[PDB]
Design a protein around this motif. Structure first.
Motif, PDB file in Angstrom:
ATOM      1  N   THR A   1       0.823  -1.202   0.000  1.00 33.93           N
ATOM      2  CA  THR A   1       0.000   0.000   0.000  1.00 33.93           C
ATOM      3  C   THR A   1       0.861   1.257   0.000  1.00 33.93           C
ATOM      4  OG1 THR A   1      -1.983   0.994   1.006  1.00 33.93           O
ATOM      5  CG2 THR A   1      -0.174   0.387   2.486  1.00 33.93           C
ATOM      6  N   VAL A   2       2.174   1.070   0.082  1.00 31.54           N
ATOM      7  CA  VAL A   2       3.108   2.189   0.090  1.00 31.54           C
ATOM      8  C   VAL A   2       3.612   2.494  -1.316  1.00 31.54           C
ATOM      9  CG1 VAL A   2       5.186   3.148   1.135  1.00 31.54           C
ATOM     10  CG2 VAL A   2       3.845   1.432   2.372  1.00 31.54           C
ATOM     11  N   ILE A   3       3.067   1.787  -2.301  1.00 31.41           N
ATOM     12  CA  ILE A   3       3.459   1.983  -3.690  1.00 31.41           C
ATOM     13  C   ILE A   3       2.265   1.837  -4.626  1.00 31.41           C
ATOM     14  CG2 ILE A   3       5.196   1.423  -5.420  1.00 31.41           C
ATOM     15  CD1 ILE A   3       6.724  -0.108  -3.356  1.00 31.41           C
ATOM     16  N   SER A   4       1.087   1.630  -4.045  1.00 26.62           N
ATOM     17  CA  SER A   4      -0.134   1.470  -4.826  1.00 26.62           C
ATOM     18  C   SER A   4      -0.938   2.767  -4.847  1.00 26.62           C
ATOM     19  CB  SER A   4      -0.987   0.337  -4.255  1.00 26.62           C
ATOM     20  OG  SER A   4      -0.918  -0.817  -5.075  1.00 26.62           O
ATOM     21  N   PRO A   5      -1.488   3.139  -3.682  1.00 25.77           N
ATOM     22  CA  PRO A   5      -2.288   4.359  -3.539  1.00 25.77           C
ATOM     23  C   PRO A   5      -1.445   5.624  -3.656  1.00 25.77           C
ATOM     24  CG  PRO A   5      -1.917   3.361  -1.397  1.00 25.77           C
ATOM     25  CD  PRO A   5      -1.372   2.398  -2.415  1.00 25.77           C
ATOM     26  N   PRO A   6      -0.159   5.513  -3.292  1.00 27.30           N
ATOM     27  CA  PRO A   6       0.780   6.637  -3.349  1.00 27.30           C
ATOM     28  C   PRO A   6       1.117   7.040  -4.781  1.00 27.30           C
ATOM     29  CG  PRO A   6       1.944   4.620  -2.806  1.00 27.30           C
ATOM     30  CD  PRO A   6       0.479   4.281  -2.799  1.00 27.30           C
ATOM     31  N   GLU A   7       0.819   6.153  -5.726  1.00 32.60           N
ATOM     32  CA  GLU A   7       1.092   6.418  -7.134  1.00 32.60           C
ATOM     33  C   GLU A   7      -0.011   7.274  -7.750  1.00 32.60           C
ATOM     34  OE1 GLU A   7       2.110   3.311 -10.195  1.00 32.60           O
ATOM     35  OE2 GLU A   7       3.486   2.652  -8.613  1.00 32.60           O
ATOM     36  N   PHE A   8      -1.169   7.297  -7.098  1.00 31.67           N
ATOM     37  CA  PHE A   8      -2.303   8.075  -7.582  1.00 31.67           C
ATOM     38  C   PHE A   8      -1.947   9.556  -7.673  1.00 31.67           C
ATOM     39  CE2 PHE A   8      -7.020   7.853  -8.067  1.00 31.67           C
ATOM     40  CZ  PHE A   8      -7.050   6.634  -8.715  1.00 31.67           C
TER      41      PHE A   8
END
Length: 22
Positions: free
Chosen positions: A14-21
């Motif tokens: 989740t530190v590279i999924s939602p942060p990519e938005f």
């Protein structure tokens, strides 16, 4: 593959999924 383990993976990535938005 019901929605069970799928989230189990995102929970850790989740530190590279939602942060990519951004």
């Amino acid at each position: 593959w019901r929605p069970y383990l799928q989230t189990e993976y995102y929970d850790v990535m989740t530190v590279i999924s939602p942060p990519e938005f951004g």
